[PDB]
Symmetry: D2
Subunit: 212 residues, 4 copies
């Protein structure tokens, strides 16, 4: 399925759309392409559009970063074991917000550290206001490994490898989770990509490789 | 923003699309409509299409059920505090898979209970195969409260209220989480809906109301 | 180490204590017996006392039920990989509160369902008062599989097997988690028990076996 | 209850024990002192001993660091709402392992980064061996804020304030969690302490104050 989606993405990058934006009528719950995609929530990604998926073809799982965390695994388990998908595509992307902050800064700002509160405003260009209380949850914001770059910075080699390392960790999480079959007759297959938000083109991430 | 999106959805339901499926070119990370949408991963939902959002306008957060769990809160915190959104829309939907199983059945099937394994096959119409091992994570599959109905069953009053109760719980989670400002000068506003996958039309969920 | 602790427990059950309750003076952080124990928080368990451990000998990890959940795994990973333990003992126990409620009842009572609120009072014999709001966390209360029995009910065959099944699931979680080595030259070994709070005696749980 | 426990701790520090280490016979599940204690799993802490609690008097919740995380909240909710406790004591302690590593180092070592693997061996003085795979869980190891000190280093002002800040964050988590009543007629009260493992004496942490 997926090389065909990469060709749809080549068209998309070149200025030709493939997704049909109208309502498809009544459909069954099982994704017809037997695919699940995990992508960032970033507004610049329309996952169906950039892959040329049609409505009804794939599960679309999206969170901050497109990270493979506990919820992503919950989703993938349901997708495969209950709803019959057997392929997974990861779509991280360039200029991702998860490159631009650290867990501890945001935590401290929310808790009420005045320095962290000020620093987050400086990093974001908005008037961040502390909650002034601590929380146990969420336990982790899952910012990408590495020191932060400016928010929405243009691409670079260094940031591409930081994004790619996060993709590789997600591939390893899926390929070693006890409740996802990625070998034998019920197996799932998985590939990971980085979407360039400015060009519209996907590039594939190597696996195995370094993971953060 | 949102009543305009409901009008786009009225068009969508009636057979007229509003989302433009081509690449929009270079854009900034901040969602231009300052909106975050949390929806189910169900393949029959194209969130941008059914709301008439354009690429670049909204964060799109999607998981099994569109539930407000720890990851959804992680996403919303980033969306608002770092990326300046201030409105949230919840889109649960009809014929959702989260109406059709229970946490304990799926857990036991994955663990290797032969009865549960067989029962999940009967419920799903696929050859479910146990992992044969236990896992601590995910801690909860977050199936909707109430006894399970058949997978992909047509709408009913009872199931509409089960979906609506889950939407109300998600609204309450957001409106009482320590790290989401939903009052005062940094506040976020939130509304919840059920998307009818067969008609293409949204219906709004009342709040406050019963929560499961 | 552990058969010696079982002999200390035989003494304890018979009315002879082995733990020394005074301060042992300065000690190193590494547990001297290279053991970690995971037990219920139940007030009737003094883990050091019932095993005849001395202060400084073992990590003592305790939560509601003694369940192997994400935090228990966090603890065990630190215990072994950083602090050199290589044996794990699970101590579930009789008359455990985790036999007496269900996740959904407590959730609904906390959310504000008036029926659930009343029912929890009836089950607990205390004036339970709803919080009147929903929360994403904790995602699961981890009550033992099976229908609830009365709070603090005396032992039975049925409840012993419900406790034992939870112990077996915890053993399977540990023995299949990606980040706990339970084979090869860095391996950890693990055994599981039920502590009888009334007699003071441990009984060992079979493994492999049914897991809930 | 708690000032009496502090006097028992003064005796303990001075070389006089108060906890009785034998089996107390049959007891009810409700902690008789209506207290829950959250402490580190560190082997040098025997919580009942250092507070002079008797078996049956208090819930004893223990994890790496004594941190207030999602599981600690799960435990406290059960403790109060089902089992009638209404006081909480936090016991962090000196020379805690959570002062000596960072989440990202341990994650990377477990994932298989050879540099991180080597560095963890150097920090711990043991032969740390990578798992060679990624995991989504545990999402956070919850090392204390601040740069790492040597494992099991002697006390200092700087490390005392790092421990105290973690205690204050835990107090704030409890005092702002939606499902713990810490005001009104069902309220819980809470105090936080640092246990000196070398002297045996507790010292109380100020609240409100800085939180990491
Ligand atoms: Na779309
Ligand atoms: Na003890
Ligand atoms: Zn992103
Ligand atoms: Zn759904
Ligand atoms: Zn128990
Ligand atoms: Zn410690």
């Amino acid at each position: 399925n997926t090389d065909a989606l990469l060709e749809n993405n080549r068209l998309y990058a070149g200025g030709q759309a493939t997704h049909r934006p109208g309502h498809p009528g009544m459909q069954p719950i099982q994704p017809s392409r037997r695919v699940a995609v995990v992508a960032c929530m970033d507004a610049r990604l329309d996952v169906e559009d950039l892959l040329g998926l049609q409505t009804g073809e794939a599960h679309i799982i999206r969170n901050a970063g497109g990270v493979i965390n506990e919820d992503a695994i919950r989703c993938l388990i349901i997708s495969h074991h209950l709803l019959n998908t057997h392929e997974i595509i990861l779509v991280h992307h360039t200029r991702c917000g998860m490159l631009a902050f650290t867990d501890d800064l945001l935590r401290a700002g929310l808790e009420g550290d005045a320095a962290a509160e000020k620093l987050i405003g400086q990093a974001t260009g908005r008037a961040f206001v502390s909650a002034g209380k601590a929380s146990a949850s969420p336990a982790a914001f899952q910012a990408f490994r590495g020191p932060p770059e400016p928010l929405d910075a243009p691409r670079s080699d260094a940031s591409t490898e930081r994004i790619a390392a996060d993709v590789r960790r997600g591939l390893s999480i899926i390929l070693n989770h006890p409740w996802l079959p990625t070998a034998g007759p019920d197996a799932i297959t998985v590939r990971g990509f980085i979407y360039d938000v400015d060009t519209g083109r996907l590039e594939e991430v190597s696996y195995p490789g370094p993971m953060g």
